[PDB]
């Protein structure tokens, strides 16, 4: 849309793959603070915040924790302790016209700096003296929304970079988004270490004869020995017996 009143989405209740994020081909710059990319690919959270917008290439250096500039001081400001990562693509083809893909007008006049993630979309007249240009002209007629004038002759510093920022919130987290796969094929009739959806143990697995009710997932005999388990993939019931041991 614009850096003026950026666009947002609150991701929740899914399995965050990431297989494409920062691994798809046309990504230009991606870097996160506080979290490593692979751990990220295995981390899981309560919610996600995506914030896309378009800025001029020469201003990408201002999207950083507490970084200072124009776009990051009066337009859109990310916190100082911001955990999460930003990504920027040189959209030197996707959003540009020789006539000027300047439909969006960024903010160049603000009364006071932004609090982190404060949508500050407004249509006002920055001024110096008493009146705005509705009754005055020349002096004190300033308008914060300036066009971009994106056209292809423009150099890199003025080529529209599309940027998307991800923010992971972690307070009181009955986390609804965790998507790491990691499911290996099952082996039967051999002493094997098994990990069924959190149940960890060791033993030999054998075809079952027990009628599990559809809402049950585990089976236990007397004295809490977990005796059987249903597979989370094929729903087949399996019996567990510890492989042979004894004195010599």
């Amino acid at each position: 849309a614009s850096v003026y009143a950026w666009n947002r989405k609150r991701i929740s209740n899914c399995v965050a793959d990431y297989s494409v994020l920062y691994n798809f081909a046309p990504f230009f710059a991606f870097k996160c603070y506080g979290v490593s990319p692979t751990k990220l690919n295995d981390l899981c959270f309560t919610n996600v915040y995506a914030d896309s917008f378009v800025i001029r290439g020469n201003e990408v250096s201002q999207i950083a924790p507490g970084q200072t500039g124009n776009i990051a001081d009066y337009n859109y400001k990310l916190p100082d302790d911001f955990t999460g990562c930003v990504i920027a693509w040189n959209s030197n083809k996707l959003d540009s016209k020789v006539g000027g893909n300047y439909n969006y007008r960024y903010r160049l006049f603000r009364k006071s700096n932004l609090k982190p993630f404060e949508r500050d979309i407004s249509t006002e007249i920055y001024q110096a003296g008493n009146k705005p240009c509705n009754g005055v002209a020349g002096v004190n007629c300033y308008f914060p929304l300036q066009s971009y004038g994106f056209r292809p002759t423009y150099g890199v510093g003025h080529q529209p970079y599309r940027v998307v920022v991800l923010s992971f919130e972690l307070l009181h987290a009955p986390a609804t988004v965790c998507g790491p796969k990691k499911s290996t094929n099952l082996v039967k009739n051999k002493c094997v270490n098994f990990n069924f959806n959190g149940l960890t143990g060791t033993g030999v697995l054998t075809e079952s004869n027990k009628k599990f009710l559809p809402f049950q997932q585990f089976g236990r005999d007397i004295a809490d020995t977990t005796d059987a388990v249903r597979d989370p993939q094929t729903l087949e019931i399996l019996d567990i017996t510890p492989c042979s041991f004894g004195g010599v």
Partner: antibody, heavy 118, light 109 residues
């Protein structure tokens, strides 16, 4: 009338400090992008510093770390503290109010000479 | 940091005619500009900013043109008081930035 009057120009021994002041009129400073520029005798001009409306200031590279811009909002004025004045900094310094893409610098300051003992 | 180069260095033209000054950039400057007339003895005065927009008051006798990396200023009919130095200032990096020219000395006869 709308104007910018300057003060602090003078002479100081090398390595010394000084403080330049800039007063405005018929126009506010708190809400105006302020910018101090300087000119060596006989040469062109060079952007020295700027202070924004949020406090984030900036300086040229030649003077980074030594000069500091600040502004007395109560009486609509700007200030620039300088220190460790060396042989180069002998120049006339101008105060300006810059709008940018919507009108380039127009309103300028009377200037202030800054020379050294030798 | 685009370095601007003015041309020619000096110019002496008979009264009543036109005058043409070129200012050349090294990167793109297409509409980031201004032209200042510093009459000898005081601070400069803005005449034409951006590409060719005439600053308020500034006599129509001035005309700016050019785009990209090259621009030119032209004066219709020089009067005796037009003698001053002129500079083309770019601001392609606005927060915080400017880059001045070498200036031009204009006289009469």
């Amino acid at each position: 009338e709308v104007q910018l009057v300057e003060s602090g120009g003078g002479l100081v021994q090398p390595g010394g400090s000084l403080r330049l002041s800039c007063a405005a009129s018929g126009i506010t400073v708190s809400r105006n992008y302020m910018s101090w520029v300087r000119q060596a005798p006989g040469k062109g001009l060079e952007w020295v510093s700027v202070m924004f409306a949020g406090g984030s200031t900036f300086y040229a590279d030649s003077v980074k770390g030594r000069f500091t811009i600040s502004r007395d909002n109560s009486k609509n004025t700007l200030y620039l503290q300088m220190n460790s004045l060396r042989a180069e900094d002998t120049a006339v310094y101008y105060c300006a109010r810059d709008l940018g893409v919507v009108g380039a610098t127009d309103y300028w300051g009377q200037g202030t000479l800054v020379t050294v003992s030798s | 940091e685009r370095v601007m180069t003015q041309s020619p260095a000096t110019l002496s033209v008979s009264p009543g005619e036109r005058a043409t000054l070129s200012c050349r950039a090294s990167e793109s400057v297409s509409s980031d500009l201004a032209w200042y007339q510093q009459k000898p003895g005081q601070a400069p005065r803005l005449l034409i900013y951006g590409a060719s927009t005439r600053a308020t008051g500034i006599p129509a006798r001035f005309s700016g043109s050019g785009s990209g990396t090259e621009f030119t200023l032209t004066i219709s009919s020089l009067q005796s008081e037009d003698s001053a130095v002129y500079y083309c200032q770019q601001y392609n990096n606005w927060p915080p930035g400017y880059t001045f020219g070498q200036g031009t000395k204009l006289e009469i006869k």
